[PDB]
């Protein structure tokens, strides 16, 4: 079939004290209203209707996804008005879906439910009974049959006892919605155009609307407060543990768990406490994931283990690797199979080959090492001159004596040596032992402060 | 109006395994009853009588509060027997509250609402029903009206029913309390001083006796155990959290974050998980602080951006600086505007000036560095000849080459240049490019063992 | 008296999506089935009979307990069946208790309780009462006696609605167990060997069955899944949390502490958030512990402070000790009393004396440093050549400059002081002040890139 959604998102956010939209502060590392665009173009959306007031600046900056229509709402004048204003854009044979952009959590096998609910020519609607309805919009029914919804503000002290209350989402097709939404009037406790009318409106013209639920609580829950937005991330993050548990991902403590982008993974993959991981990450068979680690878009290979107090970012780790505790891989590290990182250490544009290792507080950038290679402790490519990076090529089977600085650009052949201290400036040949160093002396019965 | 606190601290608290006073055990950064003395200043009490027992040394070298009046109750024979002794400092003419120094989250509204309710010439009491009431003062009322509290060992089983019961805290008049207290007699199950009794003896001289109820039971809960004040450490930490979700600042996981101390702060902060703040800390506008960070007693500009497992003690830095992950800034380090400090780096009674930047493995100590500063990986300013501390100077748009040493005191000018693997024993000028290096030679055909 | 136990670990775990046996996989840093061997011993079994059905390698491989007897289970056609494999070792004399490899959390306390309970000539299960009693096995009784147990595929509609169930536990003495088992016919709904029938053919022979409860529900529940481990975790590390805490141990979020191995403790021991112990840990009086601290089978005397983000295995810490933060102690790592160690330095195979300080961006291997020495930042003890290892020692009262690289073997006497920047190839003497350094030059009017 057809279908196009429009999102509300053009409401004040206040209660936020934020200089930024409501609608763009991140859940689970993305915008709310990312969260129920992704649920439209998953549902199948044909458009998306973006229906904003201000901030509109900051929003297409943020917002860029290709089936999505801005519509201005210049004044808030109540929902029923806000879709007036993308009534225009409607297909007639086409179902509309109406969505707000402060309600993250809603799921597509809601919406897909919802979808099929929706009787010909009639009206589907999404409602839930809630132990204190105040506030919500109230659902009338007569004889069993939705006949309409009250708003808390018009309903009388007796049908504020209704607990069934209007969620917000409904769908009905453009041409319906066109003729409803241009009826619409304002005479009411808030003196504006209700979206809610159009039950009404639908029942005395014969039509049917048809009230479906969602699957739990949270799917409905709209952000007006900070406090409100940190509830539903629990609730993102419980779920998204589950699944990895269900999945056969071993977490040591799920409500020590962050998933803030995608995970893909193998079997037997164990992770402890306080991780995190971010954007998309990718890990083989058996990786074991230490304490407190941050993993952003990294390529983690099979048996690798990661120990406590890692951060990885934009890394490519092949299999058997171990790296860390205190580590840092910056954007372009690249580890050989076997290749081992210690304490203290940081990489960035660096590619450590098979079996090599870095041990202790070394920095390595803008480097090529080879494979079975080992860099001393203390070790440091200077790759800058102040203007420019230059790079440092380490053959296989080298030896870098600790402190040893590498100004680059500078070439060492395979199995040279470099002794402990020195700095270097020039190429060192293939089997040579590179070296500058000012012989130790002494200075007898020497009296310090 | 007049008034004045007594706060109980004289009871042993065994069941803490500590050698170290019950009411000194910290909660959120601060003593238990330290907790106690700043409502009761906060509420205005005009003296603060602190009854206690032993551990007396312990106690006034950790409480040092002006209106402090020390009362010793060398035997602790009851409550009675307690406020007895703090008697004849009482003021005739003044309110006297009564508190525990065990019960730490009692809120000053409620006892805002306690002090307004006492009647004239009676008493204000509190109280709270319990499911499970046993071991608490049960409240008698005849015909609706408090005649008095009959403890737990004195109760008859039908009195052990009823379930208000005494949380303890009561206001009277300095004279009425006088009176009353004189009146006191031990024949009783305990065989001690009730300080319960006196609202029978003030009910049967005609006075009346309020009972107001606290807003939460973690108000008025006692401590007598380690796991009790854990509880309530979480209860603190998770109210602390709410305020500050609603008052703009976003947690990325309320449960985990702790403040011990106190936060000012600007708009769109962002914290996310494991992160402790104590002592005094100012936050700008939009800073963002990364998981498990530590931060005490620092001052953070708008902008900032703190990484990752970031410790930071008596600093200050200013606006548009990046520091971490893995940094360590210690007393004194200051940070001019745009400044960044990378991981692995620790500073001391250092300022690092506007965009200067100390990116790897790093130690500035006792430094003065200007603007747009470049500090190589491996740098470190050698403060300290063993007796004594010296000073590093280094001017603006200097450069100084990886793994360098700067031997204390000494001056670097403006656009020098310091080779890697540089031994900075003397001046720089401005301009000039210091070295102290060995040229780089070579041995064929060298073989390790 | 005489008991044996027979541990059924022979059934397929596949919701777990594991290459591993799933009695196997760990909780609280320990094999579930060794949970239950544990428990088996510390009860006073005799001897343990294990009944496995494949991955009988892996298990061989990860058990080793000398009172194991391995049974082999080629076909696993029911717990019926499985005990008839074991059924050769049972003494007629002895009691035998069966027990699950998949159900970690049983305690003794209650398996003691069981015990008391069997009569003579009779059996002892446990049962426990269940809101939702779906999938296992349902007691019936007459007359309110125990007369077997209906298998959830067998039992009627209405006796299903019993919520009494079998756990699964259950203790006889090894000559009825035979008999009983021996009659075991596999006709019914899952058409397997149901141990579960022995409760009948017991009650018709005349014998009695006396059903005990557990004290906790998680006390039988098993594991089948990995989100089942995760919750039984939670439950293990909130029981050991809340002992500590009773016993004298400050634990600042009992919710963010692990504690997967032994630890032993003095008083007034503070532990702060996210800190993992593991192995055998020993605390002296007064330890402080930071957050996020990983300590693994270490000693650690009185008043040690152990700042946040320390890394500890295998060490040996004096009493009034100070390391970290960003601290890796590797196995070997001594320190003697008062010795302290700052942030990023990493320790292996050495021992730091009394009063010694090890401040900053330092490596120690295979070194042994005397008392009141002072390692400048940026030291590194250079202990391996490529083939062996070597020891570095370091004289009382030495002190050494910043960035100074030690070749192994070398020893610095007492009272020697090493110039910053040294590279140390010869012993040097006492008194005497070791220096390699190329006096600074300067180069005017020098321009960078
Ligand atoms: C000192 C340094 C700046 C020189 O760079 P360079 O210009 O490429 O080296 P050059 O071969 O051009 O020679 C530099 C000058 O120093 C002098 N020089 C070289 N080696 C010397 C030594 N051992 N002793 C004294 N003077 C020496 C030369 O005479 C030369 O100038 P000249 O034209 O008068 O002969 C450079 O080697 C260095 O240490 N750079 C820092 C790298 C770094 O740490 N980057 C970190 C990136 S994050
Ligand atoms: C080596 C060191 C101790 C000398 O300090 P100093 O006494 O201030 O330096 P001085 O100029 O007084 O001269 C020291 C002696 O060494 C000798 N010397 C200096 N430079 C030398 C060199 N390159 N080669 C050989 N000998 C040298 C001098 O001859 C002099 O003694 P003299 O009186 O016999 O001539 C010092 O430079 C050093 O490295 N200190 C450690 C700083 C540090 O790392 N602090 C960390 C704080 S946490
Ligand atoms: C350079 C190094 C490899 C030499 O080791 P060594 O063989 O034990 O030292 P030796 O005394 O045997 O002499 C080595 C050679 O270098 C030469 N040499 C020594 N000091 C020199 C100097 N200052 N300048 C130039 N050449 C020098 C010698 O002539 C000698 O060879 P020769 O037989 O031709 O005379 C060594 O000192 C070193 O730095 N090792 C690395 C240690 C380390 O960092 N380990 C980390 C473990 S994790
Ligand atoms: C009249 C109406 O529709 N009532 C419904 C609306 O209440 P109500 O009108 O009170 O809801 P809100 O004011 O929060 O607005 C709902 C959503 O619409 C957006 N918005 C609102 C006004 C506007 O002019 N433009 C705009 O874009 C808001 O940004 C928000 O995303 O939602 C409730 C659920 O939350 C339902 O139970 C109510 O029946
Ligand atoms: C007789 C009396 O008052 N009973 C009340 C007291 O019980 P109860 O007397 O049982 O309470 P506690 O023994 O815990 O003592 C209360 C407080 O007084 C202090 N203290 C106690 C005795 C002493 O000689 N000196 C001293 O300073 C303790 O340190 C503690 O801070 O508190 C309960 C609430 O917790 C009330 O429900 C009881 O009605
Ligand atoms: C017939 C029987 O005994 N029923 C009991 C069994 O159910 P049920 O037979 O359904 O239980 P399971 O299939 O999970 O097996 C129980 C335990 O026995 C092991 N196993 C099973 C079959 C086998 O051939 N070999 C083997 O070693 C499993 O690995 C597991 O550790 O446990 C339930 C509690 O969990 C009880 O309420 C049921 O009354
Ligand atoms: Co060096
Ligand atoms: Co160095």
Redesign the interface.
């Known amino acids: 079939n057809a279908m196009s959604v429009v999102i509300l998102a053009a409401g004040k956010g206040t209660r ?5 939209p409501k609608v763009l ?1 991140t859940l689970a590392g993305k915008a709310m209203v990312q969260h129920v665009i992704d649920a439209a173009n998953e549902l199948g959306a044909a458009h998306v209707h973006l229906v904003y007031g201000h901030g509109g600046d900051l929003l297409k900056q943020a917002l860029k996804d290709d089936n999505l229509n801005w519509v201005l709402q210049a004044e808030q004048l109540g929902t029923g008005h806000a879709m007036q204003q993308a009534a225009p854009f409607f297909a007639d044979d086409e179902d509309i879906l109406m969505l707000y952009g402060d309600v993250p959590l809603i799921s597509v096998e809601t919406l897909q439910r919802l979808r099929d609910a929706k009787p010909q020519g009639g009206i589907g609607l999404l409602t839930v009974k809630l132990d204190d309805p105040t506030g919500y919009g109230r659902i009338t029914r007569e004889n069993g049959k939705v006949t309409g919804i009250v708003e808390h503000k018009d309903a009388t002290d007796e049908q504020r006892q209704i607990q069934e209350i209007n969620t917000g989402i409904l769908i009905a097709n453009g041409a319906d919605m066109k003729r409803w939404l241009a009826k619409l009037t304002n005479n009411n406790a808030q003196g504006e155009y209700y979206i809610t009318d159009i039950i009404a409106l639908a029942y005395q013209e014969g039509r049917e609307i048809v009230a479906v639920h969602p699957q739990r609580l949270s799917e409905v829950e709209g952000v007006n ?3 409100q ?2 509830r539903l ?2 609730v993102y993050q419980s779920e998204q543990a ?1 699944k990895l ?12 768990f ?1 998933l803030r982008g995608t995970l893909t993974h193998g ?2 993959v164990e992770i402890d ?2 991780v ?1 991981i971010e954007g998309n990450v990718t890990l083989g068979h058996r990786v074991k994931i230490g ?2 680690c ?1 993993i952003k878009n990294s390529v983690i290979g099979d048996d690798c283990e990661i120990s ?2 890692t ?1 990885v970012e934009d890394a490519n780790l092949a299999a058997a690797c171990t790296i860390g ?2 580590a ?1 891989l910056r954007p372009g590290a690249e580890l050989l199979e076997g290749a081992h990182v ?3 250490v ?1 990489m960035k544009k660096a590619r450590l080959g098979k079996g090599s290792k870095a041990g ?4 390595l950038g803008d480097a090529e090492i080879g494979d079975n290679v ?1 860099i ?3 070790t ?1 490519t ?1 790759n800058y ?4 990076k230059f790079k440092t090529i380490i053959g296989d089977d080298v ?1 870098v ?3 040893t ?1 590498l ?1 680059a650009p500078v070439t060492v052949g395979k199995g040279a ?1 470099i002794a ?7 190429n ?2 293939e ?19």
Request: glycine share 10%; aromatic share 8%.
């Open positions: 936020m004290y934020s200089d930024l502060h407060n900070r406090l937005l940190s991330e629990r589950e548990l269900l999945a056969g991902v071993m977490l040591r403590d799920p409500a020590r962050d079997r037997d406490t306080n995190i304490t407190g941050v406590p107090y951060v505790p205190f840092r210690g304490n203290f940081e202790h507080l070394t920095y080992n001393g402790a203390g440091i200077c001159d102040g203007a420019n030896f004596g600790s402190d600085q100004v040596t402990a201290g020195t700095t270097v400036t020039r060192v040949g089997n040579a032992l590179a070296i500058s160093r000012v012989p130790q002396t002494q200075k007898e019965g020497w009296r310090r402060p």
